[PDB]
Design a binder for these strands. Structure first.
Ligand SMILES: [Mg+2]
Ligand SMILES: [Mg+2]
Ligand SMILES: [Mg+2]
Ligand SMILES: [Mg+2]
Ligand SMILES: [Mg+2]
Ligand SMILES: [Mg+2]
Ligand SMILES: [Mg+2]
Ligand SMILES: [Mg+2]
Ligand SMILES: [Mg+2]
Ligand SMILES: [Mg+2]
Ligand SMILES: [Mg+2]
Ligand SMILES: [Mg+2]
Ligand SMILES: [Mg+2]
Ligand SMILES: [Mg+2]
Ligand SMILES: [Mg+2]
Ligand SMILES: [Mg+2]
Ligand SMILES: [Mg+2]
Ligand SMILES: [Mg+2]
Ligand SMILES: [Mg+2]
Ligand SMILES: [Mg+2]
Ligand SMILES: [Mg+2]
Ligand SMILES: [Mg+2]
Ligand SMILES: [Mg+2]
Ligand SMILES: [Mg+2]
Ligand SMILES: [Mg+2]
Ligand SMILES: [Mg+2]
Ligand SMILES: [Mg+2]
Ligand SMILES: [Mg+2]
Ligand SMILES: [Mg+2]
Ligand SMILES: [Mg+2]
Ligand SMILES: [Mg+2]
Ligand SMILES: [Mg+2]
Ligand SMILES: [Mg+2]
Ligand SMILES: [Mg+2]
Ligand SMILES: [Mg+2]
Ligand SMILES: [Mg+2]
Ligand SMILES: [Mg+2]
Ligand SMILES: [Mg+2]
Ligand SMILES: [Mg+2]
Ligand SMILES: [Mg+2]
Ligand SMILES: [Mg+2]
Ligand SMILES: [Mg+2]
Ligand SMILES: [Mg+2]
Ligand SMILES: [Mg+2]
Lengths: 116, 136, 94, 76, 58
RNA sequence: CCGACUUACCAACCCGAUGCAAACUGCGAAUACCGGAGAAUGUUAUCACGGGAGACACACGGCGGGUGCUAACGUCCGUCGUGAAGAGGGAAACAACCCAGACCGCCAGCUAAGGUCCCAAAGUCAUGGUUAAGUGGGAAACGAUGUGGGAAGGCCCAGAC
RNA sequence: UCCUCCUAAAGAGUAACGGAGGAGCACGAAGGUUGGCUAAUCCUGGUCGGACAUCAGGAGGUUAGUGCAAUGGCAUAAGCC
RNA sequence: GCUCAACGGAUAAAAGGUACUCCGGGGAUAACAGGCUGAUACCGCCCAAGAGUUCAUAUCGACGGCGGUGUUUGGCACCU
RNA sequence: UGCCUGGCGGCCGUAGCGCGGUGGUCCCACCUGACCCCAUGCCGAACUCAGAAGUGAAACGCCGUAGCGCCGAUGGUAGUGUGGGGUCUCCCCAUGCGAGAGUAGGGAACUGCCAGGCAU
C-alpha cells in the first residue's frame, strides 16, 4: 500500500516538473536499498544511474540501505554529474518529505555539484 | 388512472415525437396493438382501454402498457391569449409512436384479441393494427 | 430446405435501398467466422412466406448466389418499425 | 409566469483556435470550465481561465488517465 | 488546361448567396449563358454541388 | 418475554426483461464554425479614413422551441429564399406559391411554372392503360363481399360452398 | 441592476410573458506560498446508542464536498486539518 | 454622501382625477361592428361489455373521440 | 543474448475487473531496537532512522480463461442542405453527407531506456 499511496502523493510534483521541463534529480529510497538517477525534463531518457546496487558503491559501503550510503551515493552521483557536465536541476523529492536519507543525500548532491 | 407520483418538473415543453419510433417490437404479452400514425393517448384513454380489456377478458390473463403520461402537458383553458406567459397545467398524455405496442393481452384467443383491439380503435381516435410477439 | 434465388448487390447505400424497395428487393448479408463478407438481394414475398414457417430460424437452408449452394443459418434480425417488412435477415455459415 | 431568467451570457467557449496564430500575450480559450487544460507550454489564471504562454499553431489532443481534453503546443 | 464546356440554365435568384457567388464565380450571369471553364477536382465538385441550377455538356 | 408455523398481499435489491427526456450524453454526428497547405474564377465584392442617408414598424415558399388545440394569411422567434427594389409571366381574382431578371421601339428567333376538349394563345400522337369516381374538383378517425390486379395458400372428378 | 441551467441552427449569442432556485456579500481566517488526508452510502458487533451521535471489519470511488441558488470544474483535487 | 432598487446611472430634490375636457396621429393597436383556423359553446358522426326484464344493434348507452353550423365560446391581428 | 526486480518515456480501460497457479540468487515490503535525526490535535499506529533472525499471509510481478466493461463489424439507419412533390400536426423523389444502435467477430496487453542476480 505504501508504493501506491506514495505514487499518488507524488503525482502532482512529478507531473509538475515533467510539464515544467526542467531536468529533475529523482530519488526513491527503500529500507534495504535505493536507486538514484538524473532524468530528462520530459522523462524519456536518464543521464546518470548510480545506486547502492552498483559493484563499487555496494562494496565500499557497509550497509546498502542506510542514510550514510545515501550520502555517499549523493556525493558520487553529483560528482559524476559534474564529470558529464550537469549544472542546473530543479529538485523533486518524489513525494517524500525533505528529511532523513533524502535530506542527507540531497545535501551530498549540493556539496558535490548540483545547485539547489 | 396512470399518472406519475412525482414528475421531474411541473411543466415541460410541448415536445416533438417525429420520425421513426423505438417501441417497434413486443415485449411482455402475446397480443398487441400497433399504431402506425401519430397522435396522443390521454391518461383517461389508457385507463379506459385497460378497463375495457379487463371487461372482455373477464379477468383472464394480464394487461401490459408501455407508454406513460409522464409528461403533464399545459394546454390553455379556453378564452386566454397566447401571451400571459406559458399556459396552465391541464392534463396528462403520451404521444403515438410508429410501431409501438400500446396494450397487451394473453390467455385468450386471437379472435378475442383482435376484437378487443378494434374496441381500442373504438375507444381511441388512433389508427391500429394487430400484432403478436415476434420469434427472436 | 428452401432453395432461394438471390443475386449479388454491386453497390449498396440508402438511395440504392430506396430504389430497390421501389423495385421490390430487400437486402441481407452472408457472414460468419472468418469468411469473406458478401451480401445479397432477396425475393421479398418468397422470403416472407418461407420465414413464416417455424423452421426458418432453426434449420439449415441453402442459398443460390451466382450459381452455388451456400449453407447458412439465422443469427439476428431487424424489422420495419411499423410495417411487415424484415429490415434485415442474418446468416451464419454452416 | 415568474421564472424567465438567464445569464447575461459571458461569451465563453473556445475563441482562438488551433491553427490560428497567437500574438504576443494572446489567449487560446476563454471558458468557465477546465474542459481544455494547460498541457505543454500553457498556463492558468485565477477564475478558471487559461492563457497559453507559447505561440504558434496550437495542438488539440486528449490525454490523462481520466480521458481529459487538453490544449498543447506544436513547433511553429 | 482541359477546358470542359459549361452552361447556365437558370439563376441563383431564389437561392442562397452561396449559390449566388457560385454562379458569379463560374461567371454565369443570365439564362443560357454559355461559358468555357477549366476542369479540376475543385470545379468538378462545384459542378456536383450546384448541378441543379446549371447544366454541363461535353 | 424470546416465540412455532403459512399467506392468490406490497415491493427494497440483483438477475431475465420495458423504459425515457428543455433542463443527463460512459455514443457519435452532418452541412459547416474556426481555421491552416491549392485549379480556375471573380471590372477589388477586404481594410483605413472623411461628406451625407434611411429605417430601431419587413410579409409569404423550403427548418426546430414556448406557443397554440402536435390549428392558422398565427407568433417572440434563430433562418435561406422570392418579393421589397420587378413589371411582365398562370393562378377565378390574391406581389412571395412555379418563374424571371424589362435600357427603348420594330405586327422579328432558342426560352422557364400555369403548360396543350370548348372559352383558349398550347398536341385532341404510338405503345400500358386505368377507372364510375367526374377522379381531377375539399371535411377525418371509421369501415364495409365494389373493383384491375399480383403473389402466396387449402379442398379438389376416390365429390369442394 | 446584478446571478444557476436547456434556448438558439453540436464556436458564439440570441426573446419577453419559452420551466425551476437567488444577492446588495462574508472568511484576517473558510486565506495564500508551503507540510498532510480523501468521500457518500449499507451489512456485522458492542454498556450507553434507537435507522442514524461514538467505536471497531467489510462493499463502491467522486454517486461526498463545495460559503451560498446552481451549473460547469475539480483526485494533482479549489473537497477534508 | 445611491433600497438614484427601473440600479450604462435624464435632477441634489416629485403623487393622482377628468363622464367638463382639448390637440397631433394610427387600422402600428383594441371593442359592437368588419377574414383564415376549428380546441370548443352547440350540433352532426365512433364500436359494443350492457341501465336497457334477456336482448347490442329500440329513449338507448356507460370506461372511452373526430368533422364541423360556420351559429355560438374562443385563437390570430388586420380590410375599415 | 533471456527470465525475475527496481528507477522513468510511447497507448491512457483491445491497458482496465475477475478466477485457476508461480518468486526469494537479485529483489520489495512484512519484520528486530526505535534510547537517536525526525511524528502524533492518543499510540515509531503513519512516516522514519541503526539492521537482516525469518518472511511471501496482504501486496507486487508473470502465464491461462474471453466470465465482465471496451473496440469496431458488413448489411442497415434517421436526419442536413440541395432542386421536385404530396397523402402538409407529418411523409416521400436524383445525388453529395451520413449518425447511432448493436451483432456474427478481437484484445488480459503491447513498447522503450538504464542497471542488479543469474550464462554464453
Ligand atoms: Mg420519439
Ligand atoms: Mg432522403
Ligand atoms: Mg432525446
Ligand atoms: Mg437530454
Ligand atoms: Mg429579405
Ligand atoms: Mg417583427
Ligand atoms: Mg417549419
Ligand atoms: Mg429539440
Ligand atoms: Mg415555432
Ligand atoms: Mg404567419
Ligand atoms: Mg403557422
Ligand atoms: Mg422564414
Ligand atoms: Mg406577377
Ligand atoms: Mg387559387
Ligand atoms: Mg392575374
Ligand atoms: Mg412543358
Ligand atoms: Mg383554341
Ligand atoms: Mg357442399
Ligand atoms: Mg449553444
Ligand atoms: Mg446555431
Ligand atoms: Mg499541498
Ligand atoms: Mg446498527
Ligand atoms: Mg461557495
Ligand atoms: Mg483553496
Ligand atoms: Mg433605465
Ligand atoms: Mg382628435
Ligand atoms: Mg373586434
Ligand atoms: Mg371588411
Ligand atoms: Mg374552417
Ligand atoms: Mg374541439
Ligand atoms: Mg330488439
Ligand atoms: Mg343507437
Ligand atoms: Mg360516455
Ligand atoms: Mg360566418
Ligand atoms: Mg370568429
Ligand atoms: Mg401585431
Ligand atoms: Mg391591423
Ligand atoms: Mg498468483
Ligand atoms: Mg513497516
Ligand atoms: Mg501473497
Ligand atoms: Mg449505423
Ligand atoms: Mg455504432
Ligand atoms: Mg482483456
Ligand atoms: Mg485478470
Amino acid at each position: 500500500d505504501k508504493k501506491s499511496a506514495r505514487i499518488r502523493r507524488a503525482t502532482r510534483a512529478r507531473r509538475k516538473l515533467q510539464e515544467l521541463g526542467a531536468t529533475r534529480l529523482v530519488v526513491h529510497r527503500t529500507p534495504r536499498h535505493i536507486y538514484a538517477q538524473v532524468i530528462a525534463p520530459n522523462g524519456s531518457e536518464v543521464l546518470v544511474a548510480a545506486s547502492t546496487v552498483e559493484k563499487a558503491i555496494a562494496e565500499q559501503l557497509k550497509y546498502t540501505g542506510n542514510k550514510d550510503a545515501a550520502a555517499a551515493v549523493g556525493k558520487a552521483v553529483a560528482e559524476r554529474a559534474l564529470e558529464k557536465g550537469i549544472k542546473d536541476v530543479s529538485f523533486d523529492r518524489s513525494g517524500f518529505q525533505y528529511h532523513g536519507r533524502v535530506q542527507a543525500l540531497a545535501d551530498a548532491a549540493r556539496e558535490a555539484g548540483l545547485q539547489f | 388512472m396512470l399518472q406519475p407520483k412525482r414528475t421531474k418538473f411541473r411543466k415541460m415543453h410541448k415536445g416533438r415525437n417525429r420520425g421513426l419510433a423505438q417501441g417497434t417490437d413486443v415485449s411482455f404479452g402475446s397480443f398487441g396493438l400497433k399504431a402506425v400514425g401519430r397522435g396522443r393517448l390521454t391518461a383517461r384513454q389508457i385507463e379506459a382501454a385497460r378497463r375495457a380489456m379487463t371487461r372482455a377478458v373477464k379477468r383472464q390473463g394480464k394487461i401490459w402498457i408501455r407508454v406513460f403520461p409522464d409528461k403533464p402537458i399545459t394546454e390553455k383553458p379556453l378564452a386566454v391569449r397566447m401571451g400571459k406567459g406559458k399556459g396552465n397545467v391541464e392534463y396528462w398524455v403520451a404521444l403515438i409512436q410508429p410501431g409501438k405496442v400500446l396494450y397487451e393481452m394473453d390467455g385468450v384467443p386471437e379472435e378475442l384479441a383482435r376484437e378487443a383491439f378494434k374496441l381500442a380503435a373504438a375507444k381511441l381516435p388512433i389508427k391500429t393494427t394487430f400484432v403478436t410477439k415476434t420469434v427472436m | 430446405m428452401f432453395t432461394i434465388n438471390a443475386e449479388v448487390r454491386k453497390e449498396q447505400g440508402k438511395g440504392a435501398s430506396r430504389r430497390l424497395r421501389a423495385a421490390n428487393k430487400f437486402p441481407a448479408i452472408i457472414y460468419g467466422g472468418k469468411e469473406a463478407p458478401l451480401a445479397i438481394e432477396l425475393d421479398h414475398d418468397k422470403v416472407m412466406n418461407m420465414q413464416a414457417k417455424a423452421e426458418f430460424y432453426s434449420e439449415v437452408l441453402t442459398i443460390v448466389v451466382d450459381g452455388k449452394e451456400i449453407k447458412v443459418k439465422a443469427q439476428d434480425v431487424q424489422r420495419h418499425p411499423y410495417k411487415p417488412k424484415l429490415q434485415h435477415i442474418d446468416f451464419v455459415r454452416a | 409566469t415568474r421564472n424567465g431568467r438567464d445569464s447575461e451570457a459571458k461569451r465563453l467557449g473556445v475563441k482562438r483556435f488551433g491553427g490560428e496564430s497567437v500574438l504576443a500575450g494572446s489567449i487560446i480559450v476563454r471558458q468557465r470550465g477546465t474542459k481544455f487544460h494547460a498541457g505543454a507550454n500553457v498556463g492558468c489564471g485565477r477564475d478558471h481561465t487559461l492563457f497559453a504562454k507559447a505561440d504558434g499553431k496550437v495542438k488539440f489532443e486528449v490525454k490523462g488517465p481520466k480521458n481529459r481534453k487538453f490544449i498543447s503546443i506544436e513547433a511553429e | 488546361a482541359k477546358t470542359i464546356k459549361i452552361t447556365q440554365t437558370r439563376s441563383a435568384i431564389g437561392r442562397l448567396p452561396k449559390h449566388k457567388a457560385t454562379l458569379l464565380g463560374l461567371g454565369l450571369r443570365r439564362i443560357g449563358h454559355t461559358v468555357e471553364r477549366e476542369d479540376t477536382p475543385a470545379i468538378r465538385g462545384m459542378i456536383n454541388a450546384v448541378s441543379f441550377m446549371v447544366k454541363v455538356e461535353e
